[PDB]
Amino acid sequence: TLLGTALRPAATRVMLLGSGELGKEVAIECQRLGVEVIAVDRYADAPAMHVAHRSHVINMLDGDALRRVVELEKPHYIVPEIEAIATDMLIQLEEEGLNVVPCARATKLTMNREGIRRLAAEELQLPTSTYRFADSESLFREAVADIGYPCIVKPVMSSSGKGQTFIRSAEQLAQAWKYAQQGRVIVEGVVKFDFEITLLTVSAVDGVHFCAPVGHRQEDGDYRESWQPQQMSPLALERAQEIARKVVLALGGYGLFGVELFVCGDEVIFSEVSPRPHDTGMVTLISQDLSEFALHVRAFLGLPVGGIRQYGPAASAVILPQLTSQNVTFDNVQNAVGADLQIRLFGKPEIDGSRRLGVALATAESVVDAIERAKHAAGQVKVQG
Amino acid sequence: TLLGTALRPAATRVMLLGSGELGKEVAIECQRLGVEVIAVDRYADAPAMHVAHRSHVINMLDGDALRRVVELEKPHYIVPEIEAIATDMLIQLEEEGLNVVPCARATKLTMNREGIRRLAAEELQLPTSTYRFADSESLFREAVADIGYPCIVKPVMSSSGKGQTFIRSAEQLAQAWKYAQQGGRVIVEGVVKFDFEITLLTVSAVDGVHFCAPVGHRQEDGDYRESWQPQQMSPLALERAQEIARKVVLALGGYGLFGVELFVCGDEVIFSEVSPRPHDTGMVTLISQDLSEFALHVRAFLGLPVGGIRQYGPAASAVILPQLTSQNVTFDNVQNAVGADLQIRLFGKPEIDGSRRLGVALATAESVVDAIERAKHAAGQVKVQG
Numbered sequence: 001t002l003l004g005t006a007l008r009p010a011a012t013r014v015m016l017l018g019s020g021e022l023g024k025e026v027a028i029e030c031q032r033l034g035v036e037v038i039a040v041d042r043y044a045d046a047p048a049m050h051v052a053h054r055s056h057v058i059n060m061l062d063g064d065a066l067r068r069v070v071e072l073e074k075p076h077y078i079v080p081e082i083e084a085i086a087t088d089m090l091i092q093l094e095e096e097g098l099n100v101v102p103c104a105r106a107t108k109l110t111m112n113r114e115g116i117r118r119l120a121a122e123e124l125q126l127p128t129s130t131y132r133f134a135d136s137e138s139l140f141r142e143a144v145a146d147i148g149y150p151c152i153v154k155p156v157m158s159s160s161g162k163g164q165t166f167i168r169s170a171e172q173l174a175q176a177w178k179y180a181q182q183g184r185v186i187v188e189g190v191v192k193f194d195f196e197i198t199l200l201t202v203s204a205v206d207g208v209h210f211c212a213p214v215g216h217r218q219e220d221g222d223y224r225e226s227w228q229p230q231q232m233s234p235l236a237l238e239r240a241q242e243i244a245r246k247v248v249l250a251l252g253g254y255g256l257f258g259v260e261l262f263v264c265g266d267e268v269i270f271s272e273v274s275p276r277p278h279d280t281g282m283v284t285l286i287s288q289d290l291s292e293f294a295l296h297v298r299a300f301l302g303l304p305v306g307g308i309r310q311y312g313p314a315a316s317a318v319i320l321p322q323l324t325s326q327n328v329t330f331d332n333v334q335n336a337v338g339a340d341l342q343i344r345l346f347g348k349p350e351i352d353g354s355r356r357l358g359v360a361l362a363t364a365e366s367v368v369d370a371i372e373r374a375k376h377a378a379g380q381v382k383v384q385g
Numbered sequence: 386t387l388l389g390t391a392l393r394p395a396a397t398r399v400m401l402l403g404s405g406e407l408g409k410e411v412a413i414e415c416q417r418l419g420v421e422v423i424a425v426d427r428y429a430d431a432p433a434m435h436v437a438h439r440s441h442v443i444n445m446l447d448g449d450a451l452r453r454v455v456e457l458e459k460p461h462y463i464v465p466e467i468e469a470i471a472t473d474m475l476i477q478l479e480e481e482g483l484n485v486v487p488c489a490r491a492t493k494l495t496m497n498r499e500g501i502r503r504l505a506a507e508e509l510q511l512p513t514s515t516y517r518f519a520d521s522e523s524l525f526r527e528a529v530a531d532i533g534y535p536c537i538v539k540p541v542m543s544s545s546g547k548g549q550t551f552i553r554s555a556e557q558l559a560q561a562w563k564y565a566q567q568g569g570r571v572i573v574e575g576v577v578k579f580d581f582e583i584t585l586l587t588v589s590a591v592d593g594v595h596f597c598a599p600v601g602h603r604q605e606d607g608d609y610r611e612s613w614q615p616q617q618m619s620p621l622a623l624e625r626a627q628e629i630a631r632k633v634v635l636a637l638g639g640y641g642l643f644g645v646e647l648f649v650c651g652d653e654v655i656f657s658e659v660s661p662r663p664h665d666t667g668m669v670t671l672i673s674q675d676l677s678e679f680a681l682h683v684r685a686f687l688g689l690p691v692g693g694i695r696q697y698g699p700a701a702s703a704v705i706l707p708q709l710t711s712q713n714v715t716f717d718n719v720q721n722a723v724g725a726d727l728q729i730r731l732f733g734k735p736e737i738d739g740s741r742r743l744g745v746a747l748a749t750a751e752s753v754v755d756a757i758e759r760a761k762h763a764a765g766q767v768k769v770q771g
């Protein structure tokens with residue numbers, strides 16, 4: 001591995017496609033190794049751009065645009081932060097010699113539930129929830145019919161629980177199908193798990209390594225809190241890793257992956273996977289020697305991970321206000337930091353509704369205490385408009 | 386404590402005067418809190434400018450120049466990273482309402498050896514080496530004869546051991562003086578024979594004075610080569626060291642992290658000098674603590690409470706200090722400089738012309754001895770070319 005000096009002619013260049021808070025930390029980790037960072041997004045002043053060398057505002061769903069910025073910047077690595085990109089142009093660019101992290105196929109399979117679900121379920125023969133894909137309400141209707149209640153319906157091209165609907169009644173169908181169209185879907189058979197985890201799996205030169213399992217709390221399709229390590233059976237864990245390894249290897253390429261699983265007893269079920277750092281993984285900003293962000297960069301740059309140290313019970317708790325403003329201020333911060341307590345404020349230029357503006361990070365003697373400590377600090381911050 | 390959003394009208398603005406690798410980290414820590422950062426230095430593309438919202442290049446020794454840029458960016462805080470700045474204007478600005486970190490007086494006192502030495506030694510009555518100042522070659526010679534041999538002569542305005550001579554005899558008098566003139570006034574200090582020296586990273590915050598675990602370091606030709614933490618010391622030495630550090634920081638005044646340099650002779654501690662800001666030897670904290678010295682400085686000067694500092698066990702830093710002339714430096718064999726319990730930092734410095742710290746290797750282990758070896762080893766693996 002040979003790295004140049006940022007801004008100099010031999011500099012190594014990283015293009016970030018998506019400049020939110022996750023991209024912001026990858027940017028910091030690149031900066032730490034003197035890697036040149038170009039932050040791209042669909043709006044100006046996205047958090048990653050504050051810390052990048054330069055930025056571009058584009059319609060990332062626009063392949064030609066994507067091609068134009070890439071071509072212009074000639075990056076060594078292209079790192080997408082989100083799903084909402086023209087993965088087709090990624091494939092081409094890759095085919096053309098660009099290094100897409102972890103690999104372009106990976107991005108593609110994961111932006112569509114059909115791909116990923118089929119791969120895992122069918123191709124890899126892994127435990128997942130019961131499901132069915134539908135192209136028409138009739139079929140939708142037909143499908144929900146076969147899955148039963150309750151059931152989840154999601155757009156094959158959805159995230160943050162967008163267009164999704166939890167179905168316990170035939171009456172929602174009308175709207176359910178409509179939401180899911182707001183035109184193909186999946187109907188999944190609700191799983192009754194003890195808890196949900198994120199298994200942060202890094203694929204690198206020295207193989208696949210796992211971070212301690214990350215548990216978390218979702219609400220209204222937003223993770224609220226995450227913690228590490230989530231208490232799991234040795235057997236349960238062994239199984240989770242097996243599934244994660246098969247999947248990551250199956251998708252291919254070096255990088256940090258967020259493998260979403262459900263745990264019931266010693267039983268593990270595959271849900272989905274992010275071919276990049278996952279929001280729940282923000283707890284690794286205080287819980288490990290190497291954050292998920294640092295791991296992603298180490299991996300993609302072709303460097304060996306070797307090992308991941310975990311520092312005890314730890315937690316993250318989001319700062320998720322809901323208001324409209326283009327001039328947010330945060331008061332009472334002195335009560336949101338302290339021993340074994342930190343906070344991050346993203347630099348997002350405005351908000352109009354519900355948005356994640358920062359996160360509180362905490363460590364403690366117990367996972368439970370870590371969670372309270374983190375929750376309490378996020379809650380002391382007064383978000384003003 | 387109220388913080389705005391960077392780039393927004395109510396943004397909280399921080400101006401860094403000096404954009405080196407130390408400033409770089411301070412900038413990342415500000416950015417992590419959505420703090421707006423303007424990086425200033427005497428050359429372009431300096432490390433911290435890589436991560437700043439905006440950058441300017443001026444003569445920071447020029448009071449007028451300084452005032453212009455402050456007028457132009459209207460920062461809430463002015464954060465000096467080096468000694469060579471218009472301290473007299475800082476004072477003005479601080480009176481004109483600007484927050485100089487930790488304070489403008491602390492900055493004036495420490496910009497020259499005389500200010501800080503007389504304060505510590507005379508006003509604070511802290512233990513220090515014997516010393517004598519001199520402004521002529523003859524007075525220089527008079528000071529040596531009074532101080533005796535061996536002794537060390539140093540220019541009053543300097544750092545990273547520039548123009549310093551470890552004088553063992555009269556033979557060296559002449560060259561010593563000349564070289565000293567190369568880096569006016571000089572200091573002649575008596576040689577302290579300590580067991581080891583430390584940097585005690587002291588944080589003055591709204592909630593008091595906090596101490597990081599002692600950092601030991603090894604110096605060579607003006608540059609620190611390795612640093613490690615914690616450095617073992619008796620309980621008594623640790624207490625005396627913390628008493629000294631608390632006195633000096635409070636005496637200097639203001640919130641921030643300070644780098645208190647001490648010599649340790651068994652249970653006795655002697656004051657050497659102090660950085661009114663993060664210290665290069667403290668880079669080990671980038672791997673060894675929950676909050677690096679940079680995260681700490683920011684926390685403190687923003688007026689937030691520290692609460693406390695977590696130390697993760699034995700660790701060390703080892704500099705990447707090549708010697709070459711280039712404006713396009715590259716680093717190879719990187720795959721053999723990082724791994725389990727092993728990391729590196731590459732600063733992004735635009736050029737080199739001789740010896741210059743371009744990065745640092747960091748490692749943790751079960752003992753400082755193993756950490757240091759691991760870290761020197763990794764730094765050594767890096768193939769610097771240009």
Ligand SMILES: Nc1ncnc2c1ncn2[C@@H]1O[C@H](COP(=O)(O)OP(=O)(O)OP(O)(O)=S)[C@@H](O)[C@H]1O
Binds near residue numbers: 271
């Ligand atoms: N079959 C299922 N059984 C039980 N809970 C489910 C099921 N599918 C989803 N969930 C829950 O819903 C959350 C979001 O479901 P996802 O399928 O991950 O949706 P998404 O829109 O892709 O959200 P992201 O991308 O993970 S943020 C999960 O984290 C679970 O809490």
Ligand SMILES: Nc1ncnc2c1ncn2[C@@H]1O[C@H](COP(=O)(O)OP(=O)(O)OP(O)(O)=S)[C@@H](O)[C@H]1O
Binds near residue numbers: 547575607657
């Ligand atoms: N009186 C003294 N006795 C014995 N050793 C000394 C004495 N003064 C300095 N040294 C040694 O020389 C090193 C450099 O001295 P400094 O006074 O710190 O020089 P410097 O130019 O200010 O370097 P910086 O500011 O730390 S980068 C110290 O870290 C000690 O190792």
Ligand SMILES: [Cl-]
Binds near residue numbers: 516518
């Ligand atoms: Cl004197």
Ligand SMILES: [Mg+2]
Binds near residue numbers: 158159160272
């Ligand atoms: Mg998803």
Ligand SMILES: [Mg+2]
Binds near residue numbers: 260
């Ligand atoms: Mg999910």
Ligand SMILES: [Mg+2]
Binds near residue numbers: 543544545658
């Ligand atoms: Mg000095």
Ligand SMILES: [Mg+2]
Binds near residue numbers: 646658
């Ligand atoms: Mg010194």
Ligand code: NA
Binds near residue numbers: 485486489
């Ligand atoms: Na001040």
